[PDB]
Amino acid sequence: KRKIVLLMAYSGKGYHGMQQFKTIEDDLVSALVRSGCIPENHGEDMRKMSFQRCARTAKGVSAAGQVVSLKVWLIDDILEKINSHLPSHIRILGLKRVTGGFNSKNRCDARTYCYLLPTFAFAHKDRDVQDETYRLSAETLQQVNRLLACYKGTHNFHNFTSQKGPQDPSACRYILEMYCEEPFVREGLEFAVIRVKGQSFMMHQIRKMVGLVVAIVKGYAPESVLERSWGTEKVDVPKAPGLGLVLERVHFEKYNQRFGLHEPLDWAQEEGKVAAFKEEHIYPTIIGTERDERSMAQWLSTL
């Protein structure tokens, strides 16, 4: 009855992707059914409400700004309703009324991800402290950033995914920005955040991009391998865990220079919520997982 676009956020842990455990969409559909937004048959076959997501986030991957689009009964106080049938770690942050022909998946352009990791993924395997007390130096952070900056621009990223040959056009991808933020300490443990904006991403690309920069900084490999990895010959690139991977923003920067959308598509009023959900549900869960289960310490021992 009224096609809409939802801005939503979630903690990835305990789910099996967006689309053996339940998925993010299972919780949402359940909430959509219970709120009265959609009929049961529409939940059984999501095509009937024309459901679309922008990012098929993988197992364990979180999101601060996932975007979906669908037809619903536009009930009173719809946001509160849907949210009242959802857990804490899943939130519908915003609603925008949109034209019926709209498809969020196809009409979006760039993507921004985040990677939250303990800082000992950057400790040199010989000259740095080898326990939890390690603290990222300004020199090393600088190395990390210069390395991440080498990714900027266009490249043949075939070595950062799989099942794609070097001559394959779809293997080429475009990175807009990539860097690491200044570290912070939560209860004796230090972490840091990596941000990456790309026009589009392939399977494991970000995880492999981060895995390689980790392998270099730690000193398991020389800087040379970064430029080598773009050559046609195959190079086994280390794939970092997906635990700290966070979909941050789905962009529509090129939407108007291509279309002209019953109301504009920016989430400016929801920004305080966006940050809040990140600080309350996304970040502490990742931190809690590294503290108790040691995802990163385990993956590091495999290099």
Residue numbers in the entry: 83 to 101, 108 to 348, 352 to 394
What did the original publication write about this model?
One of the first identified was the pseudouridine synthase 1 (hPus1p), which is a member of the TruA family despite their low sequence similarity (<20%;). We determined the structure of the catalytic domain of ΔhPus1p and the D146A mutant of this enzyme. The atomic model shows the typical fold for a pseudouridine synthase from the TruA family.
The D146A mutated protein was further shown to behave as the WT enzyme in solution. As expected, no activity could be measured with D146A ΔhPus1p with the catalytic aspartate residue 146 mutated. Similarly, N4 of the MES and N1 of the HEPES molecule are nearly indistinguishable. A HEPES molecule is bound to the active site in the structure of pseudouridine synthase 10, although its orientation was different. The positioning of a sulphate group inside the active site of ΔhPus1p may be irrelevant for the enzymatic reaction per se, but clearly indicates that the active site cavity is not neutral, a property that was suggested to be important during the catalytic cycle.
